[PDB]
Amino acid sequence: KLLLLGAGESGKSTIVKQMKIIFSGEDVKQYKPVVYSNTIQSLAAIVRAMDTLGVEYGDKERKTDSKMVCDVVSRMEDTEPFSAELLSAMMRLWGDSGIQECFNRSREYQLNDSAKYYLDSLDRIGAGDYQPTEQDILRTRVKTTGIVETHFTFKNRLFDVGGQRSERKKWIHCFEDVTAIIFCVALSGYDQVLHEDETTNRMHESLMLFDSICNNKFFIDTSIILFLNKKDLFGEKIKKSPLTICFPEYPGSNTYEDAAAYIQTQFESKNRSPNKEIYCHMTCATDTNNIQVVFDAVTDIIIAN
Amino acid sequence: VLGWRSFDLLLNSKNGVAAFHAFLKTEFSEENLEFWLACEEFKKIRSATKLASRAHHIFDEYIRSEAPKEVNIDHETRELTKTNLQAATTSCFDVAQGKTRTLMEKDSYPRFLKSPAYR
């Protein structure tokens, strides 16, 4: 029995799609829609935040193709293949300096994780013949509700859940006899806020969450493995976004190694019983090797029992 | 009968809904549908007071923080509902119901089709 628990948008589900790649056409045919949404949406997000932040368009003539997108999101017709005029309206838009200016401030609002990745493939996916990439399926986002169980045997039971606060009351169920628990944590969250209340620091919620999950009685003789996921997003931002935005205290220098050291110490300290050990891992749910390599190691800690 | 595999067809099927529900009940997210069927009845009330009454009850059952059948909406959705609750109108829980529909549709619905329950 394995619990893939964690806060919201930490990738508890992107990790399950690597337990799969370790996707029949019937399925790949299913993510075509999803990838459409994630794209149109992400673009939508930056359009809206353009107003909320006061970010002038690099070209007035964009207000046009711009609004043409929001209507799509609105008309709900955003799960269907980009009409010619759209795939362009977006490409032309995704190419305005304003959009970029407001996009670079994407920490000030809620914007899809895979926003960049998809928009940097507007053309690539806007093909009449288009079929979803091994990655395209992974970089997708679909808020998981309830507990989703999947099975499989590697070296001789999986439980997915919802990360938001209103899902956590349902967790208590599959809490009986949990072999090990993989706990996802979006490194990127250190300077963002929860989806549920535009107040709480995502990073902080993770810590308060883990602290709860970590020292639970049900898991005294249970393996606690921690996945400090999204280490890639974390790296490209740590250089221009102080870790102090999360820990006023943080005395280190803003570098991948430094901040990771600290962020790793904070979680490990939320552990009580000295008669116990935890397993950190700078993962990246959207890179099969890394997940593959790490999951292997994990299977050990578990089998090493 | 079979058209289910549009989503709203599943919803407008006194048989469909009851079915889907059994699925969710195991998957642990039947509150989404309960809240949805709720807002559906809510809509049929004409009496201003009876509306305020239920508006408050739905809130305490589904929206309220740590509510029993608390649904998964975002900050902006919740406050908005919270404000609407300040004057029970039939359009009160619209957005909340809205977002909820999607959550079921794009998430638990598919995983629902491809499964025993729908075979």
Ligand SMILES: Nc1nc2c(ncn2[C@@H]2O[C@H](COP(=O)(O)OP(=O)(O)O)[C@@H](O)[C@H]2O)c(=O)[nH]1
């Ligand atoms: N760039 C990037 N995206 C990631 C990583 N891990 C998860 N994501 C993306 O972040 C969003 C949230 O992950 P998801 O599995 O939905 O987390 P869940 O909130 O537990 O479902 C999705 O767009 C994922 O593909 C990562 O290491 N790098």
Ligand code: ALF
């Ligand atoms: F926390 Al999730 F989809 F599992 F947002």
Ligand SMILES: [Mg+2]
């Ligand atoms: Mg999920």
